[PDB]
């Protein structure tokens, strides 16, 4: 392999219905209802994949009115303290779900195909596979401006922030929440073209 993405697997055509319908159906099974959905998927660790930055950004965002309109799905496992901190936030709020089991590719595809926003707060990323997989299904990326993530994401494809800085990430999530208009559709298709450009 050469770390390309399979356009014949990560495609929306495998998915059924409208994107809003899929997002509503997915939220329902977590006791939640229609909100603006954010997703992290990766290992929990200090210094590499950036779950610590994302947790701090969430703690910052928890104090503001706009927090009522957000939803957060954290997916992964690893450093036990990060897992406990994540569970703590899951228990404090009903708009936060945490999954610590490994999920199938088909399920993760269904996730990417309804979740509408993926956060990739990495300290360093070589290839940006997660960003391409998300982009190929319409999820808009919010990643730190490191590694191949800045190669992949351009002016009109996502949001970039400085790695390791929680406040900038929380501000980015606020800007993306502000970004929630019908324009999302344009912003989605840009992603889907650029991802195909990295097949």
């Amino acid at each position: 392999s050469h770390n390309g993405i399979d356009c014949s697997f990560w495609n929306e055509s495998y998915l059924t219905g409208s994107r809003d319908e899929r997002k509503k159906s997915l939220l329902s099974k977590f006791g939640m209802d229609e909100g603006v959905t954010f997703m992290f998927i990766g290992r929990f660790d200090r210094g590499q994949k950036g779950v610590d930055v994302l947790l701090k950004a969430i703690e910052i965002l928890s104090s503001k009115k706009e927090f009522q309109e957000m939803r957060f799905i954290i997916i992964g496992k690893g450093d036990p303290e990060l897992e406990g901190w994540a569970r703590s936030l899951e228990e404090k709020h009903g708009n936060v779900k945490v999954i610590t089991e490994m999920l199938s590719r088909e399920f993760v595809r269904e996730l990417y195909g309804s979740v509408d926003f993926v956060i990739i707060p990495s300290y360093f990323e070589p290839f940006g596979l997660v960003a391409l997989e998300a982009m190929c299904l319409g999820a808009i990326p919010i990643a730190s401006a490191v590694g191949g993530l800045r190669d992949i994401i351009t002016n009109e494809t996502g949001i970039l922030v400085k790695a390791g800085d929680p406040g900038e990430l929380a501000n980015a999530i606020l800007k993306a929440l502000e970004l929630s208009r019908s324009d999302l559709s344009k912003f989605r298709e840009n992603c889907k073209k650029r991802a195909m450009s990295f097949s």
């Binding site: 392999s1 050469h2 390309g4 993405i5 399979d6 356009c7 014949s8 195909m196 450009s197 990295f198 097949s199």
Partner: protein, 254 residues
């Protein structure tokens, strides 16, 4: 009768010259590694516009060269220059794809842009020094005298120089890189890079297949083939010229 078929085929070839010109011009228009694409299309536009029409009338139909003999040299120079340039543009594109497949790591946008610009500049420089070669190196004349016909200088030194410069060296480069390119085209270490590899491999195959009869029979003539019928010589020449038309058809197919 005899010449009815000949008129029909000459009309067809004139149409072909025009389609070559137009198709390359279209590919050039949609542009303005797209700089290598532009360089190749420029060389093929120049072939169809300068080289092919004059060969079509003179060498292929039969009308004798009553044009100014001071321009016979310019037509020969354009032919040599543009065909050498087209061959080496195909091989530069081949080198670019082989470096995309094998040298995936260090071939960042900065490096790739630098190398492709160097290759374009070098392509045209070598086409110049091969075309206008017996002038600076000054060891002969560029046309074959003693002929009431406009034919390239068949002097041995220039012949070896120009054919190794235009066909055999680029042929060796493409035969070096073709293995990895074909492997990539078949997914043997995602759909976009495979499509790129397949296009380049087809371009190389048609180049080799289009120019090999002419150069091969141009090497066996000086070795007892003192009578290769010039009808087949011209067929092989124009099969080489049709590469200028097949390259657009191949590019616009991907």
């Amino acid at each position: 009768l005899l010449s009815v078929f000949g008129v029909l085929i000459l009309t067809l070839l004139g149409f072909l010259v025009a389609a070559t010109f137009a198709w390359n011009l279209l590919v050039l228009a949609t542009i303005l590694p797209h700089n290598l694409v532009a360089s190749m299309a420029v060389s093929n536009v120049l072939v169809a516009a300068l080289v092919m029409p004059l060969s079509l009338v003179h060498e292929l139909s039969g009308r004798r060269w009553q044009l100014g003999r001071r321009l016979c040299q310019l037509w020969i120079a354009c032919d040599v220059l543009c065909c050498t340039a087209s061959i080496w543009n195909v091989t530069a594109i081949a080198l670019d794809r082989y470096w995309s497949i094998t040298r995936h790591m260090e071939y960042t946008l900065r490096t790739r842009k630098c190398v492709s610009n160097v290759m374009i500049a070098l392509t045209w420089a070598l086409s110049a020094v091969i075309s206008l070669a017996p002038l600076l190196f000054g060891w002969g004349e560029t046309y074959s005298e003693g002929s009431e016909e406009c034919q390239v200088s068949r002097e041995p030194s220039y012949a070896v120089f120009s054919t190794v410069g235009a066909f055999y060296l680029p042929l060796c480069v493409v035969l070096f890189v073709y293995w990895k390119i074909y492997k990539a085209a078949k997914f043997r270490v995602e759909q976009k890079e495979q499509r790129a590899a397949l296009m380049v491999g087809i371009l190389i195959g048609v180049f080799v297949l289009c120019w090999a009869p002419f150069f091969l029979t141009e090497l066996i003539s000086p070795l007892c083939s003192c009578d290769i019928p010039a009808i087949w010589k011209s067929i092989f020449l124009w099969l080489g010229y049709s590469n200028s038309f097949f390259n657009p058809l191949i590019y616009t197919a991907f």
